[PDB]
Design a binder for this molecule. Sequence first.
Ligand SMILES: *[C@@H]1O[C@H](CO)[C@@H](O)[C@H](O)[C@H]1NC(C)=O
Ligand SMILES: *[C@@H]1O[C@H](CO)[C@@H](O)[C@H](O)[C@H]1NC(C)=O
Ligand SMILES: *[C@@H]1O[C@H](CO)[C@@H](O)[C@H](O)[C@H]1NC(C)=O
Ligand SMILES: *[C@@H]1O[C@H](CO)[C@@H](O)[C@H](O)[C@H]1NC(C)=O
Lengths: 111, 122, 247, 49, 296
Amino acid sequence: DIVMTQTPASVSEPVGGTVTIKCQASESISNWLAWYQQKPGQPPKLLIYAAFTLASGVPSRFKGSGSGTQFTLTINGVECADAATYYCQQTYSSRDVDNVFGGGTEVVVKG
Amino acid sequence: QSLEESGGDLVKPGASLTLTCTASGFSFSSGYDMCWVRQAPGKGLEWIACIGTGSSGNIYYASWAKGRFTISKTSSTTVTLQMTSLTAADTATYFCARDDADYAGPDYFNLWGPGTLVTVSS
Amino acid sequence: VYAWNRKRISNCVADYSVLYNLAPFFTFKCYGVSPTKLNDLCFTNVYADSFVIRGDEVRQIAPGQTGNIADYNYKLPDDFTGCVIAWNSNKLDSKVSGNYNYLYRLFRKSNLKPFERDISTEIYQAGNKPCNGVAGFNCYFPLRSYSFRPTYGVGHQPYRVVVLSFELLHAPATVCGPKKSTNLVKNKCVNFNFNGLKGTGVLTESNKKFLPFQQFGRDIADTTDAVRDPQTLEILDITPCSFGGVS
Amino acid sequence: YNYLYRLFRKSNLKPFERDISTEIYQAGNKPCNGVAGFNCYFPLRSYSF
Amino acid sequence: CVNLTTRTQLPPAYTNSFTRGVYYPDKVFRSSVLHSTQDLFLPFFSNVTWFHVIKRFDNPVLPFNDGVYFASIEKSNIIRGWIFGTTLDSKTQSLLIVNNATNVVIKVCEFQFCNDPFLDMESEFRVYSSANNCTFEYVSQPFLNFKNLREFVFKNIDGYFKIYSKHTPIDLPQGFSALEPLVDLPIGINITRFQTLLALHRSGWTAGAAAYYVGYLQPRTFLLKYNENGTITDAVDCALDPLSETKCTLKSFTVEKGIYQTSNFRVQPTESIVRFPNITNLCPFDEVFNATRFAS
Ligand SMILES: *[C@@H]1O[C@H](CO)[C@@H](O)[C@H](O)[C@H]1NC(C)=O
Ligand SMILES: *[C@@H]1O[C@H](CO)[C@@H](O)[C@H](O)[C@H]1NC(C)=O
Ligand SMILES: *[C@@H]1O[C@H](CO)[C@@H](O)[C@H](O)[C@H]1NC(C)=O
Ligand SMILES: *[C@@H]1O[C@H](CO)[C@@H](O)[C@H](O)[C@H]1NC(C)=O
């Protein structure tokens, strides 16, 4: 029922630069959304659950903005170690859904 | 806690395999949910099917995983996934997602297991 | 409640008898229409608004009511038409760890206009020095998270509230209610009423073959003499019952 | 606070009828059984001028 | 969206309406009786706009007025659908009807129409670019030597979109054929303009021999004759010529020899003459406003 897209597919900002990834849903999912980041050869970990609350063990730079249909993750700073792929999950209605997870968006940090 | 996977090996097309997710240090409680996900070698994550660890299993399936896959709980710390008629595109890396809320579906996943790789060849 | 969902209902018949098993322990106190006669009623516009608020905050969903939910989360217009439904959901929206996933707007520059939604996550400035992205003193996050406490009374428990707004034109109607039907009786003097067409006569089999779009049947006297049954597509003759003067 | 008006009643009064009953109003599913808890309210309310 | 620059500019062709533009006004049943009704009807023997398509590419945007009569001499089903709206962009919600190879597509949505909407074996649909806020959708059975005559009447009263259709095998031929009411749409948007939709064969692109006619409805009074079956067979315009007016007054199709009174002749005034005196009672506002010093 709910189809979710993640854009842009590829991003590249300087180490002191800022990059933002927005997650859009076909219809409104209110507050139900999560952010996941995986390193190569490693399962992803939860970053921003409920689209605003920060996770445990994660730097404060990870955050969340927007609600309803459009959700944006703003990166205030990278340190050449956060270059990975970010996914967003709908976690709202999974009765008949092809995939709760959103599209892939890898981050490239040019140090 | 760990959710190390099992049952991953080379499989012929149009066959069946048994992947086992085993919990360590905890049992499959009713108040908290478990789910199953897999990751293709080249693209992002996907959800296929999973069941709740409660008294009444609220089993939930994906659109593209409607009937090919079968998941059931065999013990309090052992859950298995069965798929049949495996095709060339079914190769991926399978993970055992651990949910945090029992809202009849995959909610926020706080813990994942190391995962297993399942591939197809002839 | 701050990011309340909005739903459109139209082109369908509304059955209100189902809303006892799906929503037990519900309160149907509402405004603008008699709750009982909603079954035989037609609505042209229907809006559905659903969210979760605390038990002490359920009273705030009323026209002309002020409060935390009203001013900053969901404001109702003074001339609100439509009804609200609220039922307890402790068995569903309560967690042993805590229902921390529901958030509401707590700090806001001004009271919300009726039927408005605010999803802003900017840091609220309650002092003189600008926050500049810092959430310290005099700079609080506008959204707080519900901490439902089922141990206390119903006022500290998750309440699921569904707000329905109508307009009641009952002329270009797209949402109405059932009216049921009775089995057909023929060849006798009968009080009939077909889709609001009340009349008295003898209902007999009709030989006429009027077209599929064609519904009624008129006569020279400009009165309905032929009718097609809505339940079953059949042709009936309406003939006034036998009469005459007595001398 | 000495003036009271009925707030809860099963059905509308017929013309020229007086209702003096003080029976507790059952506004929910569970019977009140004399308790004034949730969905169990006193039918008469007092004026607050 | 592909811009078409192969259009040949030409003034529109014209032809007589003859005896077309009749539809059943209601869903009631009358047989072997004459009834007179007042409704938006196409005037008899009017001059309608004729477009010819072949390298003739006629895809203009015509005003809707109070109603539109659509007819088209067709073979191989060149005409596909119609586009309805006011601004013909995403600013205002518009309407779309297309009868593709499988079904008919009914959608009302804030479309963003291509500048040159058309269709292209047919598997290339380029008639719009986006749809923003959709309200109603519907899918039903497909509607469908010159051998096909299709008549369509589109109306918009009380937020309802009425469509009347008739399929006939055969310029406009002489005859009579009433139009049944096909589908009613409870949409409730106002329509001021429209544009038809065509299909183009690609080999450049080749357009077959077909044409379509556009008529405009007007509020008139008609007298209609129902046969014993229950269908309309003949109708008489009540304001065309004095002879037909006499038939309408007598409520009969044959008028016996004699003299009859029909109506009144009145000369309509066309100017307004207001006469009032040379008002010269100017109030002392000059002293009040233009005073150099005002009071405290
Ligand atoms: C209406 O319902 C009756 C009984 O359920 C059925 O016999 C009849 O066929 C229905 N009408 C149509 C048009 O199918
Ligand atoms: C349309 O036909 C009428 C005759 O009914 C004629 O007077 C008029 O000139 C025609 N229109 C054009 C554009 O020639
Ligand atoms: C009808 O639609 C037109 C669109 O041009 C609009 O200008 C007008 O206000 C509408 N009328 C009503 C009563 O909404
Ligand atoms: C309909 O009318 C025609 C004459 O116009 C007649 O031949 C035919 O029998 C009629 N239909 C029926 C069913 O009798």
